[PDB]
Amino acid sequence: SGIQMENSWTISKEYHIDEEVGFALPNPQENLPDFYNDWMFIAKHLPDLIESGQLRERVEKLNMLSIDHLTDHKSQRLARLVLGCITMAYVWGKGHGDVRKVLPRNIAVPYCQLSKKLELPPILVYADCVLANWKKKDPNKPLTYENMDVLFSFRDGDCSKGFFLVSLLVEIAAASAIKVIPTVFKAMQMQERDTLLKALLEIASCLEKALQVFHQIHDHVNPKAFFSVLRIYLSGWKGNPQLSDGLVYEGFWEDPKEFAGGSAGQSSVFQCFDVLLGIQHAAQFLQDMRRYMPPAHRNFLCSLESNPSVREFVLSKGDAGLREAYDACVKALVSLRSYHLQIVTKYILIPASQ
Ligand SMILES: CC(C)(C)c1ccc(S(=O)(=O)N2C[C@H]3C[C@H]4C[C@H](C4(C)C)[C@@]3(COC(=O)Nc3ccc(I)cc3)C2)cc1
Numbered sequence: 643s644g645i646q647m648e649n650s651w652t653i654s655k656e657y658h659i660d661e662e663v664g665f666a667l668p669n670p671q672e673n674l675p676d677f678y679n680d681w682m683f684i685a686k687h688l689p690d691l692i693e694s695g696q697l698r699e700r701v702e703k704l705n706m707l708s709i710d711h712l713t714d715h716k717s718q719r720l721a722r723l724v725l726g727c728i729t730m731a732y733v734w735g736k737g738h739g740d741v742r743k744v745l746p747r748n749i750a751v752p753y754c755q756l757s758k759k760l761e762l763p764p765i766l767v768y769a770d771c772v773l774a775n776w777k778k779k780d781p782n783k784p785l786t787y788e789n790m791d792v793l794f795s796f797r798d799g800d801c802s803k804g805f806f807l808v809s810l811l812v813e814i815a816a817a818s819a820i821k822v823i824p825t826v827f828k829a830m831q832m833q834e835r836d837t838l839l840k841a842l843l844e845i846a847s848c849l850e851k852a853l854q855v856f857h858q859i860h861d862h863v864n865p866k867a868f869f870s871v872l873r874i875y876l877s878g879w880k881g882n883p884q885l886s887d888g889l890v891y892e893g894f895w896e897d898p899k900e901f902a903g904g905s906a907g908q909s910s911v912f913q914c915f916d917v918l919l920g921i922q923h924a925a926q927f928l929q930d931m932r933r934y935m936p937p938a939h940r941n942f943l944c945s946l947e948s949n950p951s952v953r954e955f956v957l958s959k960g961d962a963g964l965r966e967a968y969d970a971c972v973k974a975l976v977s978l979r980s981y982h983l984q985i986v987t988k989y990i991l992i993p994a995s996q
Pocket residue numbers: 766767768771772808809812813856859873876903904905906907908909911912978981982983985986
């Protein structure tokens with residue numbers, strides 16, 4: 643394959659894709675070294691600090707903390723999540739138009755240095771607030787909504803736990819499809835009909851499960867709270883009239899810089915299975931959001947594109963079962979796309995109408 647392999651069964655660890663949670667970060671770090679307690683206090687108290695109007699003054703009194711004591715990937719990912727949440731809270735405040743156009747240097751410099759190390763933009767992205775923003779309540783119990791929590795929220799009542807955790811559980815459901823991908827390509831190389839069929843049916847089954855998990859969003863997110871509260875903190879400064887030149891990262895760049903806020907295009911799940919199934923100004927935007935995924939996940943998506951076409955293989959075999967299994971995967975992925983559009987309508991377009 644174009645996919646680098648660790649062994650005959652498992653893809654390379656260099657893709658940072660976990661067998662159990664997929665593109666999500668496995669067992670995220672929850673605590674930083676004591677050195678960073680001042681950052682953690684602010685992030686853990688964002689709801690009451692934003693609500694009381696205390697957040698900005700608190701950030702402005704922070705001392706400068708070097709990033710050199712964040713020595714491994716998980717601590718760096720946690721620090722990025724912490725600093726990114728503080729940054730969105732600092733820029734947008736309570737979300738009433740009182741924006742800050744300069745991010746103070748004692749956040750901007752460490753945030754930007756950590757972002758450079760991880761090759762992610764210095765703005766909150768999906769890999770922060772969903773893929774790394776979670777824990778198990780009971781380590782001995784499975785990955786279920788009842789047994790999990792987020793690490794950070796923005797405002798009390800913003801429904802961030804529901805929005806982030808349901809998204810994460812969709813990613814985890816997709817993980818059981820991602821781990822079958824090498825089997826698909828081995829089965830094509832070996833001309834193993836049943837192996838390919840069972841792989842495609844498993845992928846379909848897991849993507850169908852992912853849609854069923856996605857349906858839970860309605861039980862844990864209120865449309866008005868999402869649109870009027872949470873959406874503020876997922877908004878960016880690229881083409882935004884409130885920050886028309888972007889944000890000044892004090893002490894890192896002289897001039898303001900534009901970075902985009904959140905997009906569903908930041909989940910690698912869509913492109914992963916679009917490419918696998920051959921069903922790939924919107925192209926430019928799509929590729930830009932790819933640069934907001936972790937670089938290892940970009941590399942996985944690129945390796946997938948270098949592989950033979952599953953679609954053309956299946957459609958050449960005169961094999962109803964293979965085609966039905968392939969069609970079941972296409973249907974499942976299209977249903978995820980359609981549901982995303984339904985969520986955009988109910989949680990953004992309609993509330994905006996009001
Ligand atoms: C407000 C905003 C435009 C960012 C958005 C709108 C609708 C949806 S969603 O509910 O349609 N859906 C959840 C996720 C569930 C399914 C559909 C994909 C999925 C395959 C995993 C979703 C991916 O989620 C995200 O990429 N989330 C995200 C991205 C950046 C940030 I910073 C924070 C969160 C999409 C998600 C986000």
